[PDB]
Symmetry: C5
């Protein structure tokens, strides 16, 4: 067996290597579905990376080939510790009284990861089809009313980091034969975040037939989104806060027909 370890940093909207890395810009809200254009930096996008596995040289001297098979993984949200910070420029519990701790991060949690032998296959689906996404984002333009629910025509693949809006794409259950994905959403803008972390939990990646994801072209595809909640400033402006995710994937060389 071979083990790989990798991380994905969150893509909440603000640029890397600058003071708000890990956050979105402050969120603005439209008055109407017909005048809805979320500016670049104000919404989270999916993280993804392709890991290069050791090259498996193919002979074609036999009727079978070798592929790396992902048999199990561990994954952890990292930096959960930082959410014990209730002093950094936060709206206070008694804000009208300039007293108490910061309220910290609260609101919606969206945590999903995927491990596969090819890019994650996506279904386009949006809350408001008339939202105009910015040029920086990868979306289906003029998607139509059908995109507010399931439309079999509206497909994509997660081929780039930090550009596919979380609010416009999710895993396609009609595909992803060669990917395992897991997700949880808890909504509501005052909801406390609930996160666990341990190095003792393994997730088996074998399907009903005892086969894990098979890494096409010796590539292992990792994808995630880890929205922890909102940061609220003293002036009540709110931004997404994300955390990075750790992956440990155990692979074996498998003979494939």
């Amino acid at each position: 067996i071979t083990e790989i370890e990798a991380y994905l940093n969150p893509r909440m909207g603000q640029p890397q290597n600058e003071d708000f890395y890990g956050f979105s810009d402050n969120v603005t809200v439209s008055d109407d579905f017909g005048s809805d254009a979320p500016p670049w930096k104000q919404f989270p996008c999916y993280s993804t990376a392709r890991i290069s596995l050791p090259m498996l040289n193919q002979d074609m001297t036999s009727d079978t080939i070798l592929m790396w098979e992902a048999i199990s993984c561990r994954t952890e949200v990292m930096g959960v510790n930082m959410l014990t910070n209730v002093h950094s420029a936060q709206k206070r519990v008694y804000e009208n009284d300039r007293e108490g701790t910061g309220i910290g991060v609260e609101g919606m949690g969206y945590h999903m990861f995927a491990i596969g032998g090819e890019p994650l296959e996506l279904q386009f689906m949006v809350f408001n089809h008339r939202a105009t996404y910015p040029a920086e984002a990868t979306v289906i333009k003029n998607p139509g009313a059908s995109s507010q629910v399931f439309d079999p025509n509206l497909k994509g693949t997660l081929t780039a980091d930090g550009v596919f809006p979380v609010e416009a794409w999710g895993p396609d259950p009609f595909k992803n034969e060669n990917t395992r994905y897991f997700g949880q959403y808890t909504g509501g803008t005052q909801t406390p975040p609930v996160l666990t972390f341990t190095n003792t939990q393994t997730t088996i990646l074998l399907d009903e037939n005892g086969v894990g994801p098979l890494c096409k072209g010796d590539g292992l595809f990792l994808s995630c989104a880890d929205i922890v909640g909102f940061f609220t400033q003293h002036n009540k402006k709110m931004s997404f806060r994300g955390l990075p995710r750790y992956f440990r994937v155990t692979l074996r060389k498998r003979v494939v027909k």
Copy 2:
């Protein structure tokens, strides 16, 4: 072994191919049980479809027949990702300051799916028996006070998509020998929605005797309702929001004695 995949779009009330597909119209509330007539489009209805399976028999009456048996399934709520949208015309967290994110979708969750070899068998039951349903809806009319609890006379079958009100019909536990149904309700109007999604979870459909639903007339019947919660506008008008559901059903040919 044959596998089928299918979806059911939600039927929250607003019409298909129009700007509010996936939503109800804005909910209005009566003053009294005696003057309660929820307009068409303001309430959700059940989704359903019959999937045509490969024809097995020249004649459904034969001494012994082959039937498709649903032995297991996977089902997923799709589009959970869209609920990360807190910018689209939503009442804001600090609406008095015109500040903060949108409050997003909050309130009641009603999630139920059924997989069977015939239409889902329903029990009529309502909160207020004096509610007058619109002509578009399939209901028992003049159901009586009995209909606010269990009345063995008040039966139906889910034979049409988008017209059986969720608030008037539920699965009948006295029937559905040939259907498996699963339902979860969390109430409220500011409750956080909690949704999971994975392609790794299988539900076995075999009963206590090791037999799955048997598809009468080579039809597989899928039914659901997936109310995720309410959308609240700046003017405090509220509408149901629903999500579509994915089904994967594994079937095998079974020898059945008639």
Copy 3:
């Protein structure tokens, strides 16, 4: 081996075959424990029925059951005469049913055995109800003298009686309570879940006199009118019980 199916309708307080069947009357609240008299119709009572089994030493043994709360679908109604989310602004959905959930069922070969226990011993219950009169301060906790049996539908107040753990050798009972008044109701329903009724010795309830005894209470929460008057709302319960003839 025989299967019976049965239902119990809730007994929340309002009479059958009238417009508020499934609800209590609007709840009134006393000023003091010493002037506390909950009027008839304003509080829930236990539901119970005896199912006659085929006449049969042989006894019917209940080996398993399924039970479901029916009509959960109705709680998606947020239009019927409900206080609104933004009631000041005359806007939003109704708040729907919210608050305490009390869900308990029992399956036995004899009437459910009860312990009398009340929040306030000085409450005067109405003539329609079955209670212990002048029960005394000891009734606010456990008093081994204060016993009863669930012998009638719709008259034993839920707030005055619960299952007696010192008895019920021949009954299985199961209960869950979540309190509050704004609590979100949580309910599940499936036809796929079986509860085994066999005890540690591999024996189910044995039906004395060829009678199967079903009992429940299913308070789902409160209905709140525009004028803020609040009433209990209940739901009916389905039972499927599997029985076998047993040599005793």
Copy 4:
């Protein structure tokens, strides 16, 4: 095999056989930690009893002795039914409009039980070391700042009913090798109580070596605290409400190395 059944009534503060049995007196709150003196009756204490088991004759020349071994138990909180009362002199949901139900019992839940062959071994630990407990209570006087966290010298044993304050003593995990204890705390003052009751649940008391509590002196020791939450009067005064606990314990005679 021998079965014993017992109950412990709660010790929330107000005296037995008087109108507020099961409640505390109304809770007062100190202005600062230095001048903190919780009056007797305003706070709950642990319940405990020793059950006398049938006398076992000892062979005083034998390297083995006979002891009762507790192999399993059932325990139930009794009186959960009473919490459906929202009419008895409660602050109302809409107290401003003099309307709605009572708010009922809400706030913190503290549920713990212990079953052992000797008294429950306690660790003294308090929120505020400078609290002066009343003479009726059993505490460590002038315990010092270390008593706000763990201090190995602040030990006791639960040897009396209704006098060891819950807020000053908990089970000692460094001892209790001959006791099994289980506890759950949910805090808050508006939290809904969550309670279950069934006669079908057994807790095995055997340890990693297949040995249950061994009853020293043929005594079985039962302890609990069952704070269900607070009762709020119209005038906003708040008191603890407790419930009694049922125990069924299954014991066997065991020959033990001596």
Copy 5:
């Protein structure tokens, strides 16, 4: 087997000698990320200890095969009389609100110091000289930066909000953590002497105690304490460890 029983007291910020041992000092909040300096005593730090095991020295090492751990003093949270903001504070009535808000509960058992990853909410925070941090860590420290490492080598000085367990390392330590956030959240805590956690990895091997040292680490933030004047402080509880060890030929 040999059994070790040990405790770790919390390090919420107030020193061991002071009347508010178990608490932080009252929390101040900055106006901006660029003017953010949490004063010493206002934030929790990790607890840690090294237990000396019997000298064993074919080389033998102590192997931690299982543990039990319990949060102690849960009983104290039933106190709603000690100078607390009241439920009806404007009416000066009701119980104290008691402890509410975030719970951060993590423990680690290992054969060497817990390996840490530095990560902060706001990289421009200036931590006090008493605290062990990476100074001027830069914007990358708001998410994962593989260069920002440490080891938990001292009790009471590594801020919880600046360090977490490093999943890239800790081959010889088991760690477990649960976080629920908020400031009004109801605390939920359980305690029993009946639950065992197995410390063996996939290969049937527990942590191996290097230099015959067993390393215990934790943080147990139970929530916030709120004064009548609305000043808020962290409250923590101590943790019990029982570790079962066997001699292993390595």
